Amino acid sequence: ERPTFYRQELNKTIWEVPERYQNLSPVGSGAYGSVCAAFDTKTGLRVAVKKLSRPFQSIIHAKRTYRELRLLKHMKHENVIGLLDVFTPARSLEEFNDVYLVTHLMGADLNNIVKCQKLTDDHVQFLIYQILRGLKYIHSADIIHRDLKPSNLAVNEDCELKILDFGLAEMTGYVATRWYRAPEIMLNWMHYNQTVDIWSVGCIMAELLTGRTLFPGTDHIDQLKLILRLVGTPGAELLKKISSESARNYIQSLTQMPKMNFANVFIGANPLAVDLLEKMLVLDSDKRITAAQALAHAYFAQYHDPDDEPVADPYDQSFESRDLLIDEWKSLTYDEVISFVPPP
Ligand SMILES: Cc1ccc(C(=O)NC2CC2)cc1-c1cc2cnc(NC3CCOCC3)nc2n(C)c1=O
């Protein structure tokens, strides 16, 4: 049966949630809505509750609401944010207007852990291993993050990590919103594959190893120059693959530079970490190491377990190429809310 709801004002909005969720407290923004910490009295867990802001105001909003819910309902992995609950105060489809999403509450994000300082090699091993384990799973479902960064890697006290905000994607200037992006998507070179996320992992791993942003560009061009100084200018082979004639033409105009020595860039770092970095930070996305391949790298020998790195069940995203009206997206969303079954 339907739980009893109570009303409360939180982020200049009235949150209506089941009684089981108590002591709601703002913890900031999430993707397409604000997030509150809460105590789930039924499970004894601290949870994160995101209220989607105007989930059905446009076709774009309605489709993205459906998109997020489908993603959350599918993902069942230790290193990937999962859905504990989804609710609406609405008693019917015609009343249906608000969507709330409930996940585990994590203690911090990876930015909070970095704090201008280096981390130990074993801690870097454990953190990056978990990211790649989570990415292997996500990528196996043909889902791409596209915007992986320290702020969407959530970690608890004992360094257990979950990936947030995948499958959904202010890019101007000296900002962490662009520092982790693969150049092929930063400058719209081509149709981009899953290893855009592996570029991001490389950027994050370097930062955990040095305590410093790898490519802190002040803008798109400055960031590209920082990147190419490290990995070298593209060869003829990659140039052909740049389907954007405009992007390719600009690239060829640049003075050619050789790849730098990563051992001279990351002094004192584990030679295996350096090796893995060289395989992640490859300009040609076709040649970049994959998550599955990275997990088998010698750098993760003490964590790697081929029988404990699962892939996802088939994920039907045929809806992505479907044109529908707001009410049609809204009804599909409602069906998904109603049919939800909580995890064990
Ligand atoms: C509530 C929720 C629902 C959906 C998704 C999501 O990832 N959707 C795309 C489709 C996959 C993410 C969340 C989510 C969880 C969350 C958990 N803990 C914490 N803890 C915070 C403490 C303070 O430090 C930063 C982390 N912040 C969080 N945030 C911000 C969130 O957005």
The DSSP string of 123-139 is HHHHHHHHHHHHHHHHH
- Integer distance in angstroms from the first to the last C-alpha of the chain? 19
Catalytic residue among 40, 85, 165, 197: 165
Structural method: X-ray
Q: Do 180 and 76 touch, CB atoms closer than 8 A?
A: no
CA–CA separation, 163 and 150 (whole Å): 10
CA–CA separation, 130 and 142 (whole Å): 19
CA–CA separation, 131 and 274 (whole Å): 18
49 is in an annotated binding site: no
Q: What residues pair up with 102 in beta bridges, in sequence order?
A: 49, 85
DSSP SS3 for 204: helix
33 is in an annotated binding site: yes
Q: What is the CA radius of gyration of the chain?
A: 21
Q: Do 163 and 81 touch, CB atoms closer than 8 A?
A: yes
- Describe the strand order of the beta sheet including 33-40 as a list of residue ranges: 21-30, 33-40, 45-52, 100-104, 85-87
DSSP SS3 for 215: coil
Cα–Cα separations (whole angstroms), residue 204 to 35, 210, 228, 251 = 24, 10, 18, 25
Of 275, 283, 126, residue with least CA distance to 198: 283
Of 138, 156, 157, residue with least CA distance to 147: 138
Q: Do 233 and 284 touch, CB atoms closer than 8 A?
A: no
CA–CA separation, 94 and 223 (whole Å): 49
Q: What angle do CA 337, 339, 342 make, to 5 degrees?
A: 85
CA–CA separation, 334 and 318 (whole Å): 18
Of 335, 324, 334, 303, residue with least CA distance to 127: 303
CA–CA separation, 34 and 88 (whole Å): 16
The backbone region for 140, taken as left when phi is positive above 0, alpha when psi lies in -120 to 50, beta otherwise, is alpha
Q: What is the CATH number of domain 1-107+312-341?
A: 3.30.200.20
CA–CA separation, 223 and 221 (whole Å): 5
Nearest ligand 1 atom to alpha carbon 81 = 7
Q: Do 190 and 53 touch, CB atoms closer than 8 A?
A: no
* Domain extent listing, the chain: 1-107+312-341, 108-311
Ligand 1 close to Cβ of residue 35 (< 6 A): yes
The CATH T-level fold of domain 108-311 is Transferase(Phosphotransferase); domain 1 (1.10.510)
Of 209, 67, 194, 84, residue with least CA distance to 132: 194
Ligand 1 centroid from CA 91, angstroms: 27
Residue 203 backbone phi and psi in degrees, to 5: -60, -40
Beta strands 161-163 and 153-155: pairing type? antiparallel
CA–CA separation, 154 and 35 (whole Å): 14
Q: 301-333 burial, b for 16+ CB within 10 Å, e for fewer? A: eebbeeeebeebeeeeeeeeeeeeeeeebbbbb
**Atom 12, ligand 1: residue with shortest CA distance:** 164
CA–CA separation, 249 and 244 (whole Å): 9
User: Which regions of the chain does DSSP assign to beta strands (E)?
Assistant: 5-9, 14-18, 21-30, 33-40, 45-52, 85-87, 100-104, 108-109, 153-155, 161-163
Catalytic: 307? no
Residue 179, CB half-sphere, CA atoms under 13 Å: how many?
20
Burial class from Cβ neighbours inside 10 Å (0-12, 13-18, 19+) for residue 9 reads exposed
Q: Which amino acid is at 110?
A: L
